[PDB]
Amino acid sequence: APAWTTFRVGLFCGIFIVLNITLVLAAVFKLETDRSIWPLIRIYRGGFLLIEFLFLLGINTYGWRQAGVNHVLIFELNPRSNLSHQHLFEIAGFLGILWCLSLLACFFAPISVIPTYVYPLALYGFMVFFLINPTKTFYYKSRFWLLKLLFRVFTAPFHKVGFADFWLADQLNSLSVILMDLEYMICFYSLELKWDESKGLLPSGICHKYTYGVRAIVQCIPAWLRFIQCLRRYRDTKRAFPHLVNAGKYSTTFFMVTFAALYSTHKERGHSDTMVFFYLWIVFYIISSCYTLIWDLKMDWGLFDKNAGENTFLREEIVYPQKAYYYCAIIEDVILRFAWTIQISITSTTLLPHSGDIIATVFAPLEVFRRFVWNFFRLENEHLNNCGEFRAV
Amino acid sequence: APAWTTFRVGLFCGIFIVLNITLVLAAVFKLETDRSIWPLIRIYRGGFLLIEFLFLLGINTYGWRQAGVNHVLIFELNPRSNLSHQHLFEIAGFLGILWCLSLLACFFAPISVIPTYVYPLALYGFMVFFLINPTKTFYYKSRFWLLKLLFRVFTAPFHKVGFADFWLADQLNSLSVILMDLEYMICFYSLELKWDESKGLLPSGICHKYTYGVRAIVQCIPAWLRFIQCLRRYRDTKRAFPHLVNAGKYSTTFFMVTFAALYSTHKERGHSDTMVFFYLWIVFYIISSCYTLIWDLKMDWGLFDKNAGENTFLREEIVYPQKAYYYCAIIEDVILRFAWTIQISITSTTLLPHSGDIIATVFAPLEVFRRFVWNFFRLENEHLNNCGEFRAV
Ligand SMILES: CCCCCCCC/C=C/CCCCCCCC(=O)O[C@@H](COC(=O)CCCCCCCCCCCCCCC)COP(=O)([O-])OCC[N+](C)(C)C
């Protein structure tokens, strides 16, 4: 990379660091105890998760390049022009500066005239604009490639699946919280925000409950897309394995989230059917967790193979130098696959609100971390032994 | 330069920027009107000027390298392990972060126990330690070369002059304010600071007055070193020109600063000899400015030459692309050589107390800027046509 690119990476990282420190200190001093800070947390959580995802993605690209995994051939990107990790670090740092500035302005009151609710709106409006700018400025080829890919994923039955389509839909399975925060923000300004008050951003009413049957559809949105892609892939190929077995993996989420919305609704009423539904919500919690975990370990990463030989419990060939990495990865995935399922059901109105909001906010970055670790061995098991059969050489 | 070096340059620059912005805002809000902020300004001015000097020096090194001026041969540095501009930018950024942090802590009160006067002391103590660290860490070769050079300059009659000795003594002629701030700080804590009070840094006294006669000797410390070096050069070379004419250039400062302590001293008394002294101070103020300016233009930069030809008013060969640079430089040097002499006389108490401290604080960075511009054409006129007769090829 050129020297100005590394200069810009470091510049944005340093501004981000100091902005974070002053954010924490203003939080522990300037803020006032009486008002509620939760809408404010629920609104900014999505941008935080997006920035973290881009940073971790930049570390993924560095790891793939150094270890020798040909990720340009698998994604079928152009050999000549490709983003390297420094460009991703730069985008992450810039969007992080805007996030820190908007949140800081929401804590302070730098301008009297401007109402506080404007700042959250001004941040997310800018991000959409940067992505959809018509002019050939600011990584225009990257934004255009991403936009064409996004169009194909959201219209799933109609296109032939390629590695990139399959890959982005999975990433969207772990980023579901951003969609929920967006539906929550869209709902909140429309119904529970009083526009007339000068500082109405920090005011419960009905804006954080799975009651109007919308929040369930919103977390089943990515699982539905992957289930549909698996069915289309089965149509073309005509092989029941592994396309019909994989679709079921994605269908388990429907039953589990269906039951959340059911026990919570029955409980809130004076109904005695609540116990029965509670028996079922639990059963479709262990089934889903075990099914996703076994699929991860044996089919996604390709471990526990018969001819492992020396690398015991692993596969025959390994690309990353240390076996410790693989063993820590196995244990980490095992303990975080159990954490993911609980936060999914919980979002759909289960545990009384006071204790629930701190579990989701703590466990969302850990789900992004689990996807970050999943990327390494998935791409490695693709490069070695053609696992998805997307190229079929 | 390696990528980690550029990353570090940008990191320290970004932290420095945000620290400066919060410094300004805390100055215009947190600070209190009743107490005096001048001791606090006179103490930190020296560190500010040192940081600015290092940054501008880094720009000088970039300019010399690109234009093709062999500054490694002139300074006689080792061709294998030289420093580049990025390393200077890095030192400047790091020391600037420490300066901003210490001043910020002096504005706030982050720790109750610690008295405020400790922080100025903690900053300058660290800087000395970084320079004199015995261990081979943190640019140990650079610090050792600089330390040997400094020893030779402060013991001037005893060593043979080389380009590096002559060059550092001149740089010290424009950095005289740092010495004054140091003598002022050394004096202030000892006599006018009441140790018992918790916040006595921002309390007037005898500290800034040129009376005991100490401040005049500190004013003429660098001019004396250059005058002595010129006499030594004439002893070895046996040439009355330009070593006896150049020594006089440096001797004019003695008469100039001797008529400031005198007029100021006579005025404060009920003495009628004050008028006579004032008519002499102006005469030497004007004889010094013209002498230094003519020497600069004709002997240091080598302009106004007879065989200029096409480059009119310039010399025959020019290395920097645009003539506009040379013309702006001539005008800038002409108008700043008049500014330099006023603040030298003024420091030794010529004006009233209120009308003087803002002139020195504004005109000190402009003197550092004039030396920054002087460096380009001095090194260029050395590389072209060997002017100082130091190598004598
Ligand atoms: C909260 C609301 C905010 C709205 C968003 C606002 C902020 C978001 C802003 C985003 C602007 C751009 C962000 C960085 C990505 C740019 C594209 C890119 O990097 O492609 C890289 C591919 O490299 C890879 O193959 C690995 C994948 C990299 C990222 C893939 C998508 C990541 C974003 C997923 C996010 C999903 C979001 C969906 C909804 C959550 C580089 O491609 P290329 O090498 O340049 O290709 C050129 C060669 N070619 C011409 C042949 C193609």
Ligand SMILES: CCCCCCCC/C=C/CCCCCCCC(=O)O[C@@H](COC(=O)CCCCCCCCCCCCCCC)COP(=O)([O-])OCC[N+](C)(C)C
């Ligand atoms: C009260 C407030 C103040 C309190 C006091 C604070 C004090 C604390 C201050 C701490 C600051 C310490 C600064 C460290 C700088 C390292 C030195 C350096 O860079 O040498 C460079 C010289 O390279 C050149 O000659 C190129 C241009 C000239 C620079 C020479 C002097 C630069 C520093 C002038 C500074 C003037 C400052 C003087 C101050 C009196 C690099 O040398 P090299 O290329 O690595 O040579 C190696 C090859 N060799 C082995 C053959 C040699």
Ligand SMILES: CC(C)CCC[C@@H](C)[C@H]1CC[C@H]2[C@@H]3CC=C4C[C@@H](O)CC[C@]4(C)[C@H]3CC[C@]12C
């Ligand atoms: C239980 C917890 C501690 C498990 C932690 C697992 C994490 C830390 C492990 C699992 C996979 C590991 C990564 C595997 C591959 C690479 C690529 C290599 O070129 C750099 C190290 C890097 C980036 C490893 C970093 C550490 C890593 C992310």
Ligand SMILES: CC(C)CCC[C@@H](C)[C@H]1CC[C@H]2[C@@H]3CC=C4C[C@@H](O)CC[C@]4(C)[C@H]3CC[C@]12C
């Ligand atoms: C009256 C005022 C505005 C005069 C200003 C003069 C200043 C701005 C001029 C005079 C000498 C000039 C420098 C002369 C040489 C170089 C080296 C070249 O490779 C980069 C530009 C640079 C660094 C110039 C920057 C601008 C400069 C510093």
